[PDB]
């Protein structure tokens, strides 16, 4: 059945799989939905969050996407980043 009661949240249904299925008001985890982006301080190329300012390590732990049980946790052991570049000639000639 489709989540109708607030009483069946504990009985039958678990939580929204994708964030387009969230409750009226909130994110997929259940917290309030806030827009991701604020005003950038210090717009500047050399000193400022440019396009290649490297990612915060604390952006995932703060997300909760580092823990495996959370849905945000993507495992990269089977994705294309873990496949060998065949254009590398050290890897082609060895594997020929």
């Amino acid at each position: 059945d489709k989540a109708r009661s607030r009483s069946d949240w504990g009985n039958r249904n678990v939580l929204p799989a994708s964030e387009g299925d969230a409750v009226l008001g909130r994110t997929a985890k259940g917290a309030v939905a806030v827009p991701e982006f604020g005003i950038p301080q210090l717009d500047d190329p050399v000193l400022g969050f440019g396009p290649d300012s490297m990612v915060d390590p604390r952006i995932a732990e703060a997300d909760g996407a580092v823990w495996r049980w959370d849905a945000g946790f993507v495992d990269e052991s089977m994705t294309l980043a873990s496949c060998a570049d065949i254009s590398d000639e050290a890897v082609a000639d060895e594997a020929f």
Partner: protein
Amino acid sequence: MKTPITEAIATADNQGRFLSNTELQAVNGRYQRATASLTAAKALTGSAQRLITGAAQAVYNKFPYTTQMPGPAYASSAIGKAKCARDIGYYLRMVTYCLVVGGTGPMDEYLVAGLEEINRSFDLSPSWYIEALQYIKNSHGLSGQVANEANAYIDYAINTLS
């Protein structure tokens, strides 16, 4: 994070307990203060570049040797003035983070921890940043309990540098 919420969870989890009314009242006091504490962050963000370029000029007035003396540590070049107004905006942005969180959480992690070791190595005098925060403390224009929230985090930053 030194939020009143995460400080309540920590005192309950120190003794392996459920959250009683001791800890729900600490969370409730955050919500009663969050009205004035969020209109201060909205007004400091909207006057960000006015307060940043003003506070940089107040350091160059009180310390005019910082624009003349040669060397990498001073604002005597075009790169040294870009890195100086970068640092005023760092101290301003951490104040506004503490106003939307409640309590001195982001300032301790992102700003104060390790500040004394940086200001010794790169020869950055902490009296410059005190003068820059005293300008923002006098020129943000807020009043009532909204200025009372704002100045409590300008003053917390001055006590770490002092």
